[PDB]
Design an enzyme around this catalytic site. Structure first.
Site, PDB file in Angstrom:
ATOM      1  N   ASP A  16       0.745  -1.323  -0.087  1.00  0.00           N
ATOM      2  CA  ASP A  16       0.042  -0.043   0.001  1.00  0.00           C
ATOM      3  C   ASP A  16       0.824   1.225  -0.178  1.00  0.00           C
ATOM      4  O   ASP A  16       1.591   1.445   0.842  1.00  0.00           O
ATOM      5  CB  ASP A  16      -0.927   0.024   1.129  1.00  0.00           C
ATOM      6  CG  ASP A  16      -1.854  -1.341   1.406  1.00  0.00           C
ATOM      7  OD1 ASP A  16      -1.957  -1.832   0.276  1.00  0.00           O
ATOM      8  OD2 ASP A  16      -2.141  -1.572   2.501  1.00  0.00           O
ATOM      9  N   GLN A 287     -15.063   8.351  18.870  1.00  0.00           N
ATOM     10  CA  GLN A 287     -14.087   9.256  18.420  1.00  0.00           C
ATOM     11  C   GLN A 287     -12.765   8.707  17.714  1.00  0.00           C
ATOM     12  O   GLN A 287     -11.564   9.204  17.747  1.00  0.00           O
ATOM     13  CB  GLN A 287     -13.369   9.782  19.779  1.00  0.00           C
ATOM     14  CG  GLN A 287     -12.894   8.613  20.950  1.00  0.00           C
ATOM     15  CD  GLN A 287     -12.464   8.881  21.997  1.00  0.00           C
ATOM     16  OE1 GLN A 287     -11.121   9.354  22.469  1.00  0.00           O
ATOM     17  NE2 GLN A 287     -13.160   9.045  23.147  1.00  0.00           N
ATOM     18  N   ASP A 298     -11.494  -5.732   6.766  1.00  0.00           N
ATOM     19  CA  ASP A 298     -10.140  -6.741   6.494  1.00  0.00           C
ATOM     20  C   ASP A 298     -10.067  -7.379   8.170  1.00  0.00           C
ATOM     21  O   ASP A 298      -9.717  -8.587   8.298  1.00  0.00           O
ATOM     22  CB  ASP A 298      -8.888  -6.164   6.018  1.00  0.00           C
ATOM     23  CG  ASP A 298      -9.073  -6.024   4.606  1.00  0.00           C
ATOM     24  OD1 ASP A 298     -10.053  -6.442   3.705  1.00  0.00           O
ATOM     25  OD2 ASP A 298      -7.973  -5.593   4.272  1.00  0.00           O
TER      26      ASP A 298
HETATM   27  C1  LIG Z   1      -7.719  -1.864   2.485  1.00  0.00           C
HETATM   28  C2  LIG Z   1      -6.973  -2.914   1.754  1.00  0.00           C
HETATM   29  O1  LIG Z   1      -7.513  -3.496   0.818  1.00  0.00           O
HETATM   30  C3  LIG Z   1      -6.580  -3.924  -0.135  1.00  0.00           C
HETATM   31  N1  LIG Z   1      -7.020  -3.907  -1.431  1.00  0.00           N
HETATM   32  C4  LIG Z   1      -7.802  -2.951  -2.314  1.00  0.00           C
HETATM   33  C5  LIG Z   1      -7.782  -3.270  -3.542  1.00  0.00           C
HETATM   34  I1  LIG Z   1      -8.521  -2.292  -5.185  1.00  0.00           I
HETATM   35  C6  LIG Z   1      -7.460  -4.850  -3.785  1.00  0.00           C
HETATM   36  C7  LIG Z   1      -6.871  -5.716  -4.513  1.00  0.00           C
HETATM   37  N2  LIG Z   1      -7.710  -5.542  -5.831  1.00  0.00           N
HETATM   38  N3  LIG Z   1      -6.643  -7.085  -4.531  1.00  0.00           N
HETATM   39  C8  LIG Z   1      -6.331  -7.231  -3.092  1.00  0.00           C
HETATM   40  N4  LIG Z   1      -6.413  -6.215  -2.003  1.00  0.00           N
HETATM   41  C9  LIG Z   1      -6.924  -5.030  -2.435  1.00  0.00           C
HETATM   42  C10 LIG Z   1      -5.514  -2.844  -0.194  1.00  0.00           C
HETATM   43  O2  LIG Z   1      -3.967  -3.351  -0.456  1.00  0.00           O
HETATM   44  C11 LIG Z   1      -5.425  -2.645   1.578  1.00  0.00           C
HETATM   45  O3  LIG Z   1      -4.347  -3.657   2.104  1.00  0.00           O
END
Ligand SMILES: C[C@H]1O[C@@H](n2cc(I)c3c(N)ncnc32)[C@H](O)[C@@H]1O
Length: 343
Positions: A16, A287, A298
């Site tokens: 990320d 808060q 997740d």
């Molecule tokens: C909030 C979490 O959601 C995950 N996320 C967002 C997407 I668009 C995505 C996809 N296509 N595949 C696997 N994980 C995902 C992101 O990497 C963060 O870790």
């Protein structure tokens, strides 16, 4: 009292890349303030400029990966209780994801290659909004034939009582998911999936609906449940009604009755079972303002999976979910950049 590899998960191992951006950034790319989507050609330029023009931070991501890590945290007990497969590149980010995976005590096994670089997800923040755009890149290289089919690997899948794959992976390898799904069925193992995002019900229904007859527990949030009802033709925006029709969908393995589980941010979580549909209030984690709803989702599933694996009652599973969701909170401004930029 649960042995290693009791929980099996596979998905898109992503890194990320997050930063606070401005409405001129979202509009240049025609993004929505709060949303999740896969990168198209018109986005290639969104990653380069995000890191050049803004104060970005790096966090190991990937939905299913995150749950797996949260679950193993909750399990705590035997390290490597939770297994995770996926494809990464042979590069810096790749090396980081593996490292962050070991420190999670997760028994990770990746398919590494040089053609594609490790995959990333951009989290373009604005206020309390979060617009995600994934560049799967390498996470998209997963082939069952060249990883999940290998004996040493498929062997670890054969050890798990519970399997979990976010629907996000359907865009990568429906073949891999089915194999896993079909195996849970034949051996009365628990097969769980996530609706992941609206785009999954919009442009992947075929892979999703083909996998659904094997889904023992379905997860997803309100927006994903609303999109799923609309694309399936449910004709109802009522979440509890959606959970109910979703729970009745055609099921392959009759030994298990389906369970549907829909999170509503701060509003109640909804669980539908053959018997009924029940609502569960979330922890007074008020808060909390800057709280990644997606990341929260997740962690919820990770908590729920942590208990489910040892047969705790569903209400206990949900309780753990809500707990994980209050604690495991990512935040901006935490880490320090690796190299100065002073000049
Ligand atoms: C909030 C979490 O959601 C995950 N996320 C967002 C997407 I668009 C995505 C996809 N296509 N595949 C696997 N994980 C995902 C992101 O990497 C963060 O870790």
């Amino acid at each position: 009292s649960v042995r290693e590899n009791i929980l099996f998960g596979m998905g898109n191992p992503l890194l990320d890349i997050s930063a606070v951006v401005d409405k001129d950034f979202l509009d240049k790319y025609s993004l929505k303030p709060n949303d999740q989507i896969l990168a198209e050609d018109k986005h290639k330029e969104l990653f380069d400029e995000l890191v050049k023009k803004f104060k970005v931070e790096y966090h190991a991501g990937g939905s299913t990966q995150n749950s797996i890590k949260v679950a193993q945290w909750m399990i705590q007990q035997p390290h490597k209780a939770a297994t995770f497969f996926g494809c990464i590149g042979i590069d810096k980010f790749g090396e980081i994801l593996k490292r962050k995976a070991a420190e999670a005590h997760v028994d990770a096994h990746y398919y590494e290659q040089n053609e594609q670089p490790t995959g990333t997800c951009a989290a373009c923040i604005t206020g309390d909004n979060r617009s995600l755009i994934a560049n799967l890149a390498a996470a998209n290289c997963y082939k069952k034939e060249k990883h999940l089919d290998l004996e040493k690997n498929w062997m670890l899948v054969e050890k798990a009582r519970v399997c979990y794959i976010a629907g996000f992976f359907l865009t990568v390898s429906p073949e891999s998911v089915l194999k896993v799904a079909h195996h849970a069925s034949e051996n009365n193992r628990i097969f769980t999936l996530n609706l992941s995002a609206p785009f999954i019900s919009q442009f992947y229904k075929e892979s999703l609906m083909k996998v659904m007859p094997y889904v023992d527990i379905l997860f997803g949030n309100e927006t994903e449940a609303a999109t799923f009802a609309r694309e399936q033709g449910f004709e109802t925006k009522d979440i509890k009604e959606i959970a109910k029709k979703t729970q009745a969908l055609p099921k392959m393995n009759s030994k298990r009755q389906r369970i549907v589980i829909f999170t509503q941010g701060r509003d109640d979580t909804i669980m539908a079972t053959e018997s009924e549909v029940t609502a569960f209030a979330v922890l007074d984690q008020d808060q909390k303002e800057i709280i990644d709803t997606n990341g929260a989702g997740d962690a919820f599933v990770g908590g729920f999976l942590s208990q489910l694996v040892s047969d705790k009652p569903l209400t206990e599973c949900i309780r753990a979910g809500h707990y994980a969701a209050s604690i495991i909170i990512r935040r901006t401004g935490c880490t320090f950049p690796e190299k100065p930029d002073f000049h």
